[PDB]
């Protein structure tokens, strides 16, 4: 069996089945490689590898390179629909309750919608800016909780 | 009930409302021989138990741990115990399980305080009667004492061992090694934190070492730290509260920059340790050391007559690892060019 | 006979009723000791023990050391289902006191199912992520394992980055009795957590034939095990990039290990070429040093001065002992880090990367420009106490007994260590001569190779038998600048400038 192209029906088992960007292209496949190979080869390539897929990539430029001009590129390329997600710098506004729980939310669908479907074949990218800010005190500490997390969080990707 | 008493709020305190305020003491010997002896007993009761462990030898050993503390040593004797079917356990969790939380000798005496030398004997004995003036003393309530060598005299792991043969109830090491880095301040404040905590024993026993590195001291200059010297030079003065008495040893490299500044005026005795300048004495501590063969020692025994060396037992130590590393016959000839050397 | 679930009916007597991990399976043996102990016997031995359960134990490991792997695993393989509890970071999220209270309740169910049933035999595990940062919240977090009446049969682990961070009322006997530490895994360690990881791929036919397991454990001892994953992880990326040996160098293009970071191939930049025999020997001499420093016991504190004027080459010197050691730990440290640190500043990155030294059973610090750390000026005279103090302090400081630490700095004029008198506290002083004889200075050129041979002989014709006195780093510069003139006059400008550095 095999989903129609327009259906939403989570099947499983195993009863189934170039632009914009100026310069930056050798770099560009190298950093496009490791996150994208690994998870592009379908779909008994990474058990023959039987290596787990990393979680996240981050750059660092001076500013005015256009880094975020370069995110929104791999995000539109790597998924039909990631859905892209975007982080705000302050991340930890709201004193009430909040921050920490906020972040932990942020974090916490995409791996929830893994954990009822995990194995294939859902990716969540979520995208994150000025990440001076982000990493204070415990908000900071949230972040490193969850791809470290001791169950699962696979297949979630995020950019710095 | 609670763990710290400064958290909590003043208004409290005041008599009243909460007139009476008391503070857990330190074990007991006697006491600490009672909460292991319950655990103890409780399994002594049953028939299994450990014959080499004794209660009076484990309490002996523990001065500083709280209740559970003792709870806990025995539960990880326990726990090794049962490792053991898929001393003893005890000795292994004395070994590990704690992570107790509370004056290591171990760490200044790295050589056993061998006797290389007659010299050696008298600063020890020396000591003994500086402890036996301090046992009383009704008329001076505090002793001040300080060694004064060469580098590399060891005098420091000398004073330690004093300390250890002292056996005074609170002992407290002191180390530069704490203070590096320290602001002149924070120098000084540690180095407070230790005397008030010498104040609580009745008869006491502290250690102040490399006071010219202490003091930061520096040939050029020189230049010192006034606050450092401070605290030092008024401590010596100062006094316990009444009853409670204290014995400070001080380690000086070099006697007369501490005499310049009146630190020598201060110290009720001085003592001397120098280096050797024997060559018999050199092999009777090249025969304790055990390092050299035994025809390497008669090798040095000839050549040593005839001949004046001046060198401190740390620095002599290390000057023997030296020489051993190289080849035999390069031993022998190498340590005595060394030797020559450093003369 | 057995009693109906958890009645009240009292009864007495008898007539009732190892994988995957890589490393520290000694440690895994402890771990299992204490806390398994009073579980496993069933039943009467406990009581004979007569020990109550213990309440929990805590790890700390260097990041990346998958300390949360092995609490998975074991948290699962204890109890057929605890089934596993975990702790939010934050833990305590929405600033309500009420909500801090739930954060507590959670433990608190916990706490109950035994209060319901005690006796036998519920257990429970809870464990906590980021342990450390946690005031109401922590006394709170205090009471939820031990006291006031029971609380027993339940046990919860924390995995932390920093001990120190930690509170003190945790640690003590009863609520965490044991603490457990992580070290770096062992090479052999190293070697299974490779071994395992390239497994699950080798057990498949395809495999790098290239590629040995015992070749990257030699390569990295440094690597925690998150990191040596990582590691094989990375090594994937390469194969799947060629699709759309070369392993190992993409490898070394990409470790980022956070303790390998520091360069050889930064401190021995132009290499060494022995303009003298002498040279060779003082290396080896060295060397001899650093096995002396090995094989010592009742020494294991090494320091060693080797002085030479600046551009001696005594940096580059210190470098190659340092990798002639093969020491578990190897440090260098420079000003080059340092600079524009306040004099208390450079005392405490000191106290860090000497303060590593210690657990490593033997190793090598290099300190480059003692003097500079200690910043003396000619006129004046002027320099910093703290620093001074600090490094007398450190070589006299001893690591904690069954360690070794070895000393290296480099120093180019003796007449300062002599000033400050730092210089008796050296275990050694080994001469850096820079060449002084023509013929030796013509042999450096040879092994350099940078003239041609015939203007090679000129120079020597224009110095064997005179006297020179160039330092080979200075050499080096001075090549550079004569082999820019035109082939003609390249030994001219070669002798020109020999003569002013003369």
Not at chain 2, 144 to 164: N, Y
């Amino acid at each position: 069996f095999e989903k129609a192209e327009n259906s939403s029906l989570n099947l499983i088992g195993k009863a189934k089945t170039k632009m914009g960007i100026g310069g930056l292209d050798k770099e560009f496949s190298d950093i496009f490689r490791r996150a994208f190979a690994s998870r592009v080869f379908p779909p008994e390539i990474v058990e023959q590898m039987g290596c787990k897929h990393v979680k996240g990539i981050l750059l660092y430029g001076p500013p005015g390179c256009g880094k975020t001009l370069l995110a929104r590129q791999i995000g539109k390329m790597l998924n039909a629909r990631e859905p892209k997600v975007v982080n705000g710098p302050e991340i930890l506004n709201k004193y009430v309750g909040e921050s920490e729980a906020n972040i932990r939310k942020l974090f916490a669908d995409a791996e929830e919608e893994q954990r009822r479907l995990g194995a294939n074949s859902g990716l969540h990218i979520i995208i994150f800016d000025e990440i001076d800010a982000i990493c204070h005190d415990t908000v900071v500490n949230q972040l490193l909780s969850k791809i470290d997390g001791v169950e699962q969080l696979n297949n979630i990707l995020v950019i710095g | 009930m609670t763990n710290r008493p400064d958290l909590i709020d003043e208004a409290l305190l005041r008599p009243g409302r909460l007139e009476v305020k008391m503070e857990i003491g330190l074990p007991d010997e006697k006491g600490r021989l009672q909460i292991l002896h319950i655990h103890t007993a409780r399994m002594r009761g049953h028939q299994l138990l450990s014959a080499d462990v004794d209660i009076k030898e484990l309490a002996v050993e523990t001065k500083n741990f709280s209740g559970a503390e003792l709870e806990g040593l025995v539960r990880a004797a326990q726990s090794t115990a049962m490792n053991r079917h898929i001393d003893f356990l005890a000795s292994l969790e004395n070994d590990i399980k704690p992570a107790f939380g509370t004056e290591d000798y171990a760490s200044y005496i790295m050589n056993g305080i061998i006797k290389w030398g007659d010299p050696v004997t008298r600063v020890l004995d020396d000591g003994e009667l500086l402890v036996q003036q301090t046992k009383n003393s009704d008329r001076t309530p505090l002793v001040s004492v300080l060694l004064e060598g060469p580098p590399h005299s060891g005098k420091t792991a000398l004073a330690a061992k004093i300390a250890e043969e002292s056996n005074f109830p609170f002992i407290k090491i002191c180390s530069p090694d704490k203070m590096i880095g320290f602001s002149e301040t924070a120098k000084c404040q540690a180095m407070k934190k230790i005397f008030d905590d010498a104040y609580k024993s009745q008869l006491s026993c502290v250690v102040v070492d490399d006071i010219e590195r202490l003091l930061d001291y520096v040939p050029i200059g020189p230049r010192f730290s006034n606050l450092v010297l401070q605290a030092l030079l008024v401590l010596l003065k100062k006094a316990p509260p009444q009853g409670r008495k204290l014995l400070i040893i001080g380690t000086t490299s070099r006697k007369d920059v501490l005499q310049e500044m009146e630190m020598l005026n201060a110290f009720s005795t001085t003592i001397h340790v120098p280096n050797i300048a024997t060559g018999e004495q050199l092999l009777e501590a090249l025969e304790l050391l055990g390092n050299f063969k035994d025809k390497e020692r008669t090798t040095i025994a000839q050549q040593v007559k005839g001949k004046k060396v001046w060198i401190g037992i740390k620095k002599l130590l290390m000057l023997i690892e030296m020489s051993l590393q190289m080849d035999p016959e390069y031993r022998v000839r190498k340590f005595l060019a060394l030797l020559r050397e450093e003369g | 006979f057995e009693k109906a679930e958890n009645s009240s009916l009292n009864l007495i007597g008898k007539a009732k009723t190892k994988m995957g991990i890589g490393g520290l399976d000694k440690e895994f043996s402890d771990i299992f000791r204490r806390a398994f102990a009073s579980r496993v016997f069933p039943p009467e031995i406990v009581e004979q023990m007569g020990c109550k359960h213990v309440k929990g134990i805590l790890l700390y490991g260097p990041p990346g050391c998958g300390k949360t792997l092995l609490a998975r695993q074991i948290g699962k393989m204890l109890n057929a289902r605890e089934p596993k509890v975990v702790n939010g970071p934050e833990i305590l999220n929405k600033y309500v006191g009420e909500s801090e209270a739930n954060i507590r309740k959670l433990f608190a169910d916990a706490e109950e199912e035994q209060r319901r049933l005690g006796a036998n035999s519920g257990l429970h595990i809870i464990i906590f992520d980021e342990i450390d940062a946690i005031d109401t919240v922590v006394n709170q977090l205090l009471s939820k394992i031990d006291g006031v009446e029971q609380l027993n049969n339940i046990l919860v682990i924390g995995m932390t980055n920093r001990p120190d961070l930690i509170d003190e009322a945790l640690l003590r006997p009863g609520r965490l009795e044991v603490k457990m530490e992580i070290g770096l895994p062992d090479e052999k360690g190293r070697l299974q957590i490779l071994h395992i990881h390239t497994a699950r791929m080798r057990g498949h036919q395809l495999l790098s034939a290239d590629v040995d397991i015992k070749e990257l454990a030699v390569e990295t001892k440094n690597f925690s095990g998150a990191e040596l994953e990582g590691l094989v992880r990375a090594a994937q990326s390469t194969a799947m990039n060629r699709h759309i040996f070369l392993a190992s160098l993409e490898n070394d293009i990409k470790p980022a290990f956070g303790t390998n970071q520091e360069d050889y191939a930064s401190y021995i930049m132009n290499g060494i070429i022995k303009w003298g025999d002498p040279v060779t020997r003082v290396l080896d001499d060295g060397e001899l040093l650093v096995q002396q420093t090995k094989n010592s016991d009742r020494t294991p504190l090494v320091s060693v001065l080797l002085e030479g004027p600046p551009h001696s080459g005594k940096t580059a010197l210190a470098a190659k002992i340092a990798e002639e050691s093969n020491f578990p730990f190897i440090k260098i440290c420079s000003p080059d880090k340092m600079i524009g640190f306040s004099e208390t500043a450079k005392c405490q990155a000191m106290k860090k990367i000497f303060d590593d030294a210690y657990k490593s059973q033997l190793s090598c610090v290099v300190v480059d420009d003692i003097e500079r750390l200690l910043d003396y000026v000619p006129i004046g005279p002027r320099f910093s106490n703290l620093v001074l103090q600090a490094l007398l302090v450190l070589l006299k400081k001893a690591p904690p007994q069954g360690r070794k630490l070895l000393i290296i700095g480099t120093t180019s004029r003796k007449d300062v260590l002599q000033e400050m008198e730092m210089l008796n506290a050296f275990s050694t002083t080994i001469h850096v001569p820079n060449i002084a004889t023509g013929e030796q200075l013509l042999e450096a050129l040879e092994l350099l190779g940078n003239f041609k041979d015939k203007e090679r002989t000129t120079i020597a014709q224009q110095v064997k038998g005179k006297k020179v006195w160039i330092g080979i780093k200075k050499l080096l510069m001075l090549i550079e600048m004569s082999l820019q003139m035109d082939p003609e006059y390249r030994v001219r400008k070669f002798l020109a400038l020999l003569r002013e550095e003369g």
